[PDB]
């Protein structure tokens, strides 16, 4: 029951997962002359397959650890969303089928986009099934009246808007323009950025909305608005798939001299950070999350195989896309002994683990809630009369209750607790886009940080000596409407 | 099955419905110490029960007219949403049961709130089931890359935001404030209004967000942002349930002298239009849609009975909430009372505006089915000119037919949907007065807003019929 390709395992407890293995679906207009059929996803996402392996690695590590949930086994069912609402809704309909001959899911590791996460949570909160997200950062998901069983291991987007306003104030600019994506991630963030700016006496010239499925006329209008303006600093709240067409159109017209402020969704994207776009998007300043350490993640990643990973159904297409060969059940036939280290793909071409660490923490949160369920004594439980839940006949709402009261230490010595809104607080890292002198690619360099535990006015630290303002310049640009 | 309280009938083709019989759900804290239970609804909506009867009357009219669908019958399954997303999703999960003993639903007449409509459409679009809404008007539902099977009988809010900007420009103001509801109906409209007003050189002082479930502290904070401003004109994009706490708090502090510009969601709401709030909300200038005629509707409304209507499950609670009795199965109901003796919004109306959209949507579905019925071979819209089988019709074929609909209403005008499933309609500008003989709040028409005119000659206002703040004949001043 559900989609065809999936990763599945048997166990005493079943978890769910939703990852964007594909960047999107095919743009074919549908005529109703015949019965509609399923749509197909087009672009492969190598970064989204790396996140999928973190969940499996965490589950396998837990199953081999006697100190955490001994004498119990964990399973999973992981689906692909293609960052589209309908596919995720089909997967969710698969998840809740007997929660109303199918094993039950007690917890789901949430989606990536905020719209997809909202659509999934609307249906998951009916049955009180906890949902832990690793990448959704919209502030609309902190409403506990509508989203009753939503948790996330990433901070929301208020502090990013405040930090962007602080940076603009720090560099003494008062003439900017705004561009946002037309979804639940861009609009609230850009609205928050407008309020903080007006309070700081900053004038905004233009405001535009973009989308992945925009046509020629809208892109041309946005381009015309940009180049009929004397504002040099542009603030963008969007992601790579939603920003790629506009960037391509700007590049083909040879528009230089702009300063880009990037949010965490596209400040490290491979769709935008291309050497061919450097004369347009070079010198960008963006935000990044704090990185974690997983001791044996790369060794687990390097041992994937289409014939040995029986439980993994995406490995076949991963192999075919990586090695450009066609696996026998014109592209050459795959030999079956091809090393993954030869091909440079974002699967193992990384420097820091930021979202994969979020997936790791999401899995251990559920594991520790279950351990709390297992290792309690009568008279001290969280339920009506201090009674303890039965580990053999556990239910989803009990796991959600223990998640609401979680407090545990991770492998890096820090504490992990969820506030009343199911949110985490974290630091930010400020990076800058450079050009590699040897390879020739784009290198992200850290030049400052943002502290959320300090007081207002003493949160931002910037080192100006490490900034190249367009990849080659060393002087701060001028972005005021009129001379003093 | 689904919710127990429902109205349903058996027929060859089954239709769905979603109406807000209740205003909302009860606020009960859940510490999840025991198994959760389904939440209940609080406040009865007499105006929302008049919309359901419109759909029932339209279907019963179709079944009796031989020219529309001979040798066929129509049924219905109508549920209550209580203006909440979760209840609407619980009801919708029963509409798409067999598509994944359960009759199949051909089409569903949509919900009221824009937030509910998006959630319902996200689920209905998977199986390509058409959905026709009568009250949802958020620009976000015009996206056909996400909402494949959504249609409207009501226009969207861009025209109304432009009309508000034109009204402000006509009276020569440049110092205004804005308040909006924190949903899918308030934010886009107020954003469009801000975009329009910046072009005309109008300055906006403050901008706040409100909600029905707002706690005391933020309501207090919002109140003392209005009190610290020299702006008299305030523009509100919200509904009555989302605006009631703020109005109550402002009345409690006795704040007078402001000018309210009301959107069509609360420009005729009985929750805000109350005599004891008149010294705060009097003199409001708002928008209303265009009214139509449905002959024989009031006679159909006036004959409801808890015992005679076996197909309607909401009649017992309607009777109890009307006559304040309890039905034997608070005094006991004799069953012989008169509806006319109690004044409630059920039959206390002057025009049919939203309830004329339900009738129009039902005839849209009926005419699409009629067109399916009379497809001559070689003249179809499907492959090779083939036609559909009326005995085994499907939802997607109904969708193609609604995409290409062009028929005439009972008033002689033409009805047809554009490329996005939207419509176009005239607006009516009204003014709040005070009834001298009774004391109730009366809506007086003082102009309109043409939509087919040139951009700049759309607004007509006759200032001679306007009372400012309910008592004065002088235009106020708001300039900073
Ligand atoms: C661009 O405009 C900003 C804002 O007016 C200027 O920043 C101000 O400069 C004055 C003069 O030193 C200071 O007293 C203010 O405190 C500054 N304001 C802020 C918010 O920092 C800036 O000097 C202008 N830049 C140029 C090149 O003219
Ligand atoms: C967020 O970043 C700040 C600054 O980088 C961290 O504060 C520093 O913590 C170290 C470790 O105790 C101290 O030696 C420094 O003196 C601190 N800096 C300042 C300016 O106080 C903070 O710990 C980080 N937060 C988290 C959760 O890691
Ligand atoms: C308040 O501001 C409005 C808008 O600026 C003023 O309206 C102007 O009135 C003059 C005549 O006094 C006209 O010539 C302008 O064309 C009007 N402006 C517009 C709409 O273009 C209004 O007079 C001001 N009121 C006061 C007295 O402050
Ligand atoms: N924070 C984004 C999701 C996101 C974070 N990092 C990303 C990297 C790639 C794509 C999406 C993301 C959102 O709210 O939607
Ligand atoms: N269109 C409104 C709903 C609405 C319109 N008219 C109304 C009258 C009464 C109550 C609600 C309404 C919305 O999107 O939410
Ligand atoms: C979690 O536990 C630690 C000690 O183990 C304690 O210091 C901390 O305050 C706890 N968290 C909260 C939110 O109280
Ligand atoms: C609809 O029907 C009328 C009358 O037959 C016709 O004039 C008109 O062109 C048709 N199409 C539209 C879009 O009105
Ligand atoms: C709208 O009002 C104008 C006012 O002149 C009128 O001419 C037009 O016919 C009206 N349109 C509709 C659809 O009622
Ligand atoms: Ca174990
Ligand atoms: Ca008939």
From Swiss-Prot, chain B:
Effect of residue 62 to M: In HHC1; decreased G-protein coupled receptor signaling pathway
UniProt-annotated binding residues for Ca(2+): 62, 65, 68-69, 81, 112, 137, 155, 157, 198, 201, 264, 427
Membrane-side (Extracellular) residue stretches: 1-480
Annotated site (Important for ability of agonist AMG 416 to activate G-protein-coupled receptor activity): 420
Effect seen on changing residue 242 to A: Does not affect calcium-induced G-protein-coupled receptor activity
Effect in UniProt of substituting residue 383 to A: In HHC1; likely benign
Modification comment: Ubiquitinated by RNF19A; which induces proteasomal degradation.
Mutagenesis / variant outcome for changing residue 114 to A: Abolished calcium-induced G-protein-coupled receptor activity
Reported impact of residue 183 to A: Strongly reduced calcium-induced G-protein-coupled receptor activity
Spans annotated as Ligand-binding 2 (LB2): 156-291
Binding-site residues, phosphate: 47-51, 353-355
Outcome of swapping residue 397 to R: In HHC1; decreased G-protein coupled receptor signaling pathway; does not affect cell membrane localization
Effect of residue 157 to A: Reduced calcium-induced G-protein-coupled receptor activity
Paired cysteines (S-S): 41-82, 325-333, 375-387
Phenotypic consequence of residue 112 to I: Reduced calcium-induced G-protein-coupled receptor activity
Effect of residue 10 to R: Does not affect calcium sensitivity
Impact upon substituting residue 126 to P: In HHC1; decreased G-protein coupled receptor signaling pathway
Effect noted on mutating residue 51 to A: Abolished calcium-induced G-protein-coupled receptor activity
Clinical disorder: Hypocalciuric hypercalcemia, familial 1: A form of hypocalciuric hypercalcemia, a disorder of mineral homeostasis that is transmitted as an autosomal dominant trait with a high degree of penetrance. It is characterized biochemically by lifelong elevation of serum calcium concentrations and is associated with inappropriately low urinary calcium excretion and a normal or mildly elevated circulating parathyroid hormone level. Hypermagnesemia is typically present. Affected individuals are usually asymptomatic and the disorder is considered benign. Hyperparathyroidism, neonatal severe: A disorder characterized by severe hypercalcemia, bone demineralization, and failure to thrive usually manifesting in the first 6 months of life. If untreated, NSHPT can be a devastating neurodevelopmental disorder, which in some cases is lethal without parathyroidectomy.
Family to which the UniProt record says this protein belongs: Belongs to the G-protein coupled receptor 3 family.
Job of this protein: G-protein-coupled receptor that senses changes in the extracellular concentration of calcium ions and plays a key role in maintaining calcium homeostasis. Senses fluctuations in the circulating calcium concentration: activated by elevated circulating calcium, leading to decreased parathyroid hormone (PTH) secretion in parathyroid glands. In kidneys, acts as a key regulator of renal tubular calcium resorption. Ligand binding causes a conformation change that triggers signaling via guanine nucleotide-binding proteins (G-proteins) and modulates the activity of downstream effectors.
Domain note: The extracellular regions of the homodimer interact in a side-by-side fashion while facing opposite directions. Each extracellular region consists of three domains, LB1 (ligand-binding 1), LB2 and CR (cysteine-rich). The two lobe-shaped domains LB1 and LB2 form a venus flytrap module. In the inactive configuration, the venus flytrap modules of both protomers are in the open conformation associated with the resting state (open-open) and the interdomain cleft is empty. In addition, each protomer contains three anions, which reinforce the inactive conformation, and one calcium ion.
Annotated protein name in UniProt: Extracellular calcium-sensing receptor
Protein species of origin: Homo sapiens
First and last residues shown, out of full length: 20 to 542 of 1078
């Amino acid at each position: 029951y559900g989609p065809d390709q999936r990763a599945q395992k048997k166990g005493d407890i079943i978890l769910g997962g939703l990852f964007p293995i594909h960047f999107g679906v095919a743009a074919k207009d549908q005529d109703l002359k015949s019965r509609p059929e399923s749509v197909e996803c087009i672009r492969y996402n190598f970064r989204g397959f790396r996140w999928l392996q973190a969940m499996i690695f965490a589950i396998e590590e837990i199953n081999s650890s006697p100190a955490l949930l001994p004498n119990l086994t964990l399973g999973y069912r992981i689906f692909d969303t293609c960052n589209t609402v309908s596919k995720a809704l089909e997967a969710t309909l698969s998840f809740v089928a007997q929660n109303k001959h199918i094993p039950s899911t007690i917890a789901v590791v949430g989606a990536t986009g905020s719209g997809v996460s909202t659509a999934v949570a609307n249906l998951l909160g009916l049955f009180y099934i906890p949902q832990v997200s690793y990448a959704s950062s919209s502030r609309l998901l902190s409403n506990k009246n509508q989203f009753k069983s939503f948790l996330r291991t990433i901070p929301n987007d208020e502090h990013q808007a405040t930090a962007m306003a602080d940076i603009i104030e720090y560099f003494r600019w008062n003439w900017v323009g705004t561009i946002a994506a037309d979804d639940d991630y861009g609009r609230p963030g850009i609205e928050k950025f407008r309020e903080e700016a007006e309070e700081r006496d900053i004038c905004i010239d233009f405001s535009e909305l973009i989308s992945q499925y925009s046509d020629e006329e809208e892109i041309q209008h946005v381009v015309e608005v940009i180049q009929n303006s004397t504002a040099k600093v542009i603030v963008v709240f969007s992601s790579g798939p939603d920003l790629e067409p506009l960037i391509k159109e700007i590049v083909r017209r040879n528009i230089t001299g702009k300063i880009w402020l990037a949010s965490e969704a596209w400040a490290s994207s491979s769709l935008i950070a291309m050497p061919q776009y450097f004369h347009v998007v070079g010198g960008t300043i963006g935000f990044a999350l704090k990185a974690g350490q997983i001791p044996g993640f790369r060794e687990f990643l390097k041992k994937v195989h289409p014939r040995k990973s029986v439980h993994n159904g995406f490995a076949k297409e991963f192999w075919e896309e990586t090695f450009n060969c066609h696996l026998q059940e014109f592209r050459p036939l795959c030999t079956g002994d091809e090393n993954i280290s030869s091909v440079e793909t974002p699967y193992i071409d990384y420097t820091h683990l930021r979202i994969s660490y979020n997936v790791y923490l999401a899995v251990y949160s559920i594991a520790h809630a279950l351990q709390d369920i297992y290792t309690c004594l009568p008279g001290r439980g969280l339920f009506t009369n201090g009674s303890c839940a039965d580990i053999k006949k556990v239910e989803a709402w009990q796991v959600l209750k223990h998640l609401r009261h979680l407090n545990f230490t991770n492998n890096m010595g820090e504490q992990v607790t969820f506030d009343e809104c199911g949110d985490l607080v974290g630091n930010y890292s400020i990076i800058n886009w450079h050009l590699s002198p040897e390879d020739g690619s784009i290198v992200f360099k850290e030049v400052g940080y943002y502290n959320v535990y300090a007081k207002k006015g003493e949160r931002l630290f910037i080192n100006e000596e490490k900034i190249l303002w367009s990849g080659f310049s060393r002087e701060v640009p001028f972005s005021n409407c009129s001379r003093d | 099955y689904g919710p127990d309280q429902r109205a349903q009938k058996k027929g060859d083709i089954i239709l769905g419905g979603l109406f807000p019989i209740h205003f909302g759900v009860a606020a009960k804290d859940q510490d999840l110490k025991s198994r959760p239970e389904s939440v209940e609804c609080i406040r009865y909506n007499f105006r929302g029960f008049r919309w359901l009867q419109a759909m029932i009357f339209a279907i019963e009219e179709i079944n009796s007219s031989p020219a529309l669908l001979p040798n066929l019958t129509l049924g219905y399954r109508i549920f209550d949403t209580c203006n909440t997303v979760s209840k609407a999703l619980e009801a919708t999960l029963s509409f798409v049961a067999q598509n994944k003993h359960i009759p199949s639903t051909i089409a569903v007449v949509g919900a009221t709130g824009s937030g509910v409509s998006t959630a319902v459409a996200n689920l209905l679009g998977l199986f390509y089931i058409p959905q026709v809404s009568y009250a949802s008007s958020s620009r976000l539902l015009s996206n056909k890359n996400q909402f494949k099977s959504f249609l409207r009988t009501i226009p969207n809010d861009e025209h109304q935001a432009t009309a508000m900007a034109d009204i402000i420009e006509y009276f020569r103001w440049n110092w205004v404030g804005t308040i909006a509801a924190d949903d899918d109906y308030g934010r886009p409209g107020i954003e469009k209004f801000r975009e329009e007003a910046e072009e005309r050189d109008i300055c906006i002082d403050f901008s706040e967000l409100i909600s029905q479930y707002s706690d005391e502290e933020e309501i207090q904070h919002v109140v003392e942002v209005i009190q610290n401003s020299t702006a008299k004109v305030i523009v509100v994009f919200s509904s009555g349930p989302d605006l009631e706490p703020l109005i109550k708090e402002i009345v409690r502090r006795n704040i007078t002298g402001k000018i309210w510009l009301a959107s069509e969601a609360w420009a005729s709401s009985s929750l805000i239009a109350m005599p004891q709030y008149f010294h705060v909300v009097g003199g409001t200038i708002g928008f209303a849609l265009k009214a139509g005629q449905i002959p024989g509707f009031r006679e159909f409304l006036k004959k409801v009975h808890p015992r005679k209507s076996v197909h309607n499950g909401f009649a017992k609670e309607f009777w109890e909430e009307t006559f304040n009795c309890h039905l034997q199965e608070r005094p006991l109901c004799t069953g012989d009372e008169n509806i006319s003796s109690v004044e409630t919004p059920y039959i206390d109306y002057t025009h049919l505006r939203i309830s004329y959209n339900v009738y129009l949507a039902v005839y849209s579905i009926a005419h699409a089915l009629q067109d399916i019925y009379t497809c001559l071979p070689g003249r179809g819209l499907f492959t090779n000119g083939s036609c559909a089988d009326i005995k085994k019709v499907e939802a997607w074929q109904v969708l193609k037919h609604l995409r290409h609909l062009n028929f005439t209403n009972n008033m002689g005008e033409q009805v047809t949907f554009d490329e996005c499933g939207d419509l176009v309609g005239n607006y009516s500008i009204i003014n709040w007065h005070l009834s001298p003989e009774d004391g109730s709040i009366v809506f007086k028409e003082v102009g309109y807003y043409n939509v087919y005119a040139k951009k700049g000659e759309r607004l007509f206002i006759n200032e001679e019929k306007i009372l400012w703040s309910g008592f004065s004949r002088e235009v106020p001043f708001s300039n900073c």
